[PDB]
Amino acid sequence: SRSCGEVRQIYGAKGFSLSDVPQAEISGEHLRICPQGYTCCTSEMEENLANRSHAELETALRDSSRVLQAMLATQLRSFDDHFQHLLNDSERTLQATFPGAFGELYTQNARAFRDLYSELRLYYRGANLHLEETLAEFWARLLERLFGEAPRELRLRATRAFVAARSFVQGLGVASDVVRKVAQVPLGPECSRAVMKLVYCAHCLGVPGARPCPDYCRNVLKGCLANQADLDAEWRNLLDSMVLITDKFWGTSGVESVIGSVHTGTLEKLVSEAKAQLRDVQDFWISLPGTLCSEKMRCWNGMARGRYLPEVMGDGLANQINNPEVEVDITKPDMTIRQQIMQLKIMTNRLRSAYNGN
Numbered sequence: 001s002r003s004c005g006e007v008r009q010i011y012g013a014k015g016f017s018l019s020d021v022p023q024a025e026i027s028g029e030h031l032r033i034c035p036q037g038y039t040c041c042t043s044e045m046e047e048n049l050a051n052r053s054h055a056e057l058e059t060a061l062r063d064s065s066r067v068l069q070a071m072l073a074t075q076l077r078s079f080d081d082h083f084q085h086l087l088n089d090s091e092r093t094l095q096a097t098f099p100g101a102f103g104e105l106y107t108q109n110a111r112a113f114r115d116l117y118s119e120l121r122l123y124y125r126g127a128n129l130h131l132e133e134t135l136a137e138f139w140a141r142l143l144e145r146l147f148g149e150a151p152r153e154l155r156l157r158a159t160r161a162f163v164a165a166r167s168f169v170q171g172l173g174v175a176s177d178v179v180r181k182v183a184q185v186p187l188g189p190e191c192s193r194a195v196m197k198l199v200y201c202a203h204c205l206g207v208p209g210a211r212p213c214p215d216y217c218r219n220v221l222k223g224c225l226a227n228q229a230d231l232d233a234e235w236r237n238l239l240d241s242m243v244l245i246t247d248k249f250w251g252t253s254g255v256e257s258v259i260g261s262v263h264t265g266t267l268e269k270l271v272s273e274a275k276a277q278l279r280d281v282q283d284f285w286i287s288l289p290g291t292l293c294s295e296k297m298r299c300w301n302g303m304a305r306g307r308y309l310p311e312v313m314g315d316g317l318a319n320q321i322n323n324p325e326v327e328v329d330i331t332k333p334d335m336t337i338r339q340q341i342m343q344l345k346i347m348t349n350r351l352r353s354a355y356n357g358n
């Protein structure tokens, strides 16, 4: 008892200097973060351990962000490349059948057809948002190069198909960007305090083998990630809209059939997998506290070993007003996070609009 051996062992395994560690327990009068009591930690050790815990939590968060980003990027690239390939192969089928099938009108107008397809690619890329004018001019210089009353319907169908595809890809890209920018938001100093007291203060108070209580760590991380948790609602909204817009991919007027029919398996599986991934990460913004506590981090409640009494806080900034472990100013939001929320709102609007109308 009262020996600093084990704490010295752990503090040494951290790579830190072994000169700064006391032989036995000293007075904890000097401890700023950890509750003051007989301890094996000097102020030096306290600061060092604090820095360590903070850097570790940072690393975990950044890792989660990297995983999510990678997934969304993969989905994005997949759907984008496929949507490109459908049209490109519609053009290859075109060039294969059409000249061999019928008259010199085609072979003379071939560059005009190529320009039509290229303009459709520009429409899909979002470089040109009005296809009515470009189509009307296509028919104008096709007429002046001479295609019945129909297919004016192909205009409408291509419109509603291509806007759906573009909206889905844009959605994936936007989610990816939101995650990207939010990931660079730094942790608060009070959050760093609470985290230190969550992790290494157990070591400092003489219980180095003690495990942090689940509700305790939970409240701490809900205190730290409170701003990130505000993204929940709009995130779910965007994901819901992205799940919705894939319904337009199917049917004779469906996106697939339309992008394939411009001359007149796969995407289904991709859409299924996408649905799986999105329904997996719908919980993302509020899931972090529960995830990091259950994996990377009878029990240590922050004072001593024992039960953790306080009940777990709700998700979001405002619900942290009474947070026992960390002190949150709910009057100050993170403006970056709020901006990203706005972005989510915008893209969600675009997707809803794309779903039910013009």
Ligand SMILES: *[C@@H]1O[C@H](CO)[C@@H](O)[C@H](O)[C@H]1NC(C)=O
Pocket (backbone or CB within 6 Å): 081, 084, 085, 088
């Ligand atoms: C579609 O055709 C264009 C013509 O330049 C080509 O560059 C592109 O590789 C094709 N689609 C894709 C993205 O593979």
